[PDB]
Amino acid sequence: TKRLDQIFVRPNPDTKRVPSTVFIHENGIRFQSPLRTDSRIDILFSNIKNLIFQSCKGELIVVIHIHLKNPILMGKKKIQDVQFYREASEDELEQEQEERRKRAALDKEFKYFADAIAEASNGLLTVENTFRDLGFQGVPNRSAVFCMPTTDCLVQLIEPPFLVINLEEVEICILERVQFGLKNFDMVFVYKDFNKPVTHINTVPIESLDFLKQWLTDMDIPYTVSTINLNWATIMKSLQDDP
């Protein structure tokens, strides 16, 4: 049985951490909930919308992240995202070379397991990889974090709540608060489903604006530039009722 040992499962808000194993079976994966009273969690391949490998490069952990089509029960909550991670951690030079070695080994181990999940899904799943070189700093929640695209998504997987935007589902991206002086701007992702709450990524370094414009265009996502922060509460209620 293909397995990934000694990992930790998230979401885990406040339970003492306990290493566990993810096992691959005929129709999906199974693993131990980080919340003790829960009993084994099974996720069917057919319920996985995105299977993401995120390298530990520039981060403290390596990640396999699963974004679900339908929410599953775990830790008494219905959740749409589950992930497995491990933390990346003689003379000073050798200590640094060893750390690089371990980090490369960690990425390879996690990438192989993600590949084994895709293989067992018989065509259903494709491993998406985050592209660090295309990533940018921004604030979807409270802290400044690093958002990265894959071939199909824009994600933020380090700081919960985890964010997975499927690019095919985006109606438009409005770039807000871009002005003469300012050193940062705000992004709003509007989904084609107008009942879906828009996604704000605030405080993106102004120095990334041109790169994101092109990336957006490369992903066939229309954008509009705004000097101010728009309404959204108002704006969406419009599109929901009628144009």
Curated annotation (Swiss-Prot):
Oligomer and partners: Forms a stable heterodimer with POB3. The SPT16-POB3 dimer weakly associates with multiple molecules of NHP6 (NHP6A or NHP6B) to form the FACT (yFACT or SNP) complex. The FACT complex interacts with the CK2 (casein kinase II) complex subunits CKA1, CKA2, CKB1 and CKB2 and the components of the transcription machinery CHD1, CTR9, PAF1 and CDC73. The FACT complex interacts with the PAF1 complex. Interacts with POL1. Interacts with SAS3. Interacts with YTA7.
Note in the entry: Present with 18500 molecules/cell in log phase SD medium.
Protein species of origin: Saccharomyces cerevisiae (strain ATCC 204508 / S288c) (Baker's yeast)
Disulfide bonds: none
Protein name: FACT complex subunit SPT16
Its job: Component of the FACT complex, a general chromatin factor that acts to reorganize nucleosomes. The FACT complex is involved in multiple processes that require DNA as a template such as mRNA elongation, DNA replication and DNA repair. During transcription elongation the FACT complex acts as a histone chaperone that both destabilizes and restores nucleosomal structure.
Family of this protein: Belongs to the peptidase M24 family. SPT16 subfamily.
Domain of life according to the entry: Eukaryota
Compartments, record wording: Nucleus; Chromosome
Residues carrying Phosphoserine: 89
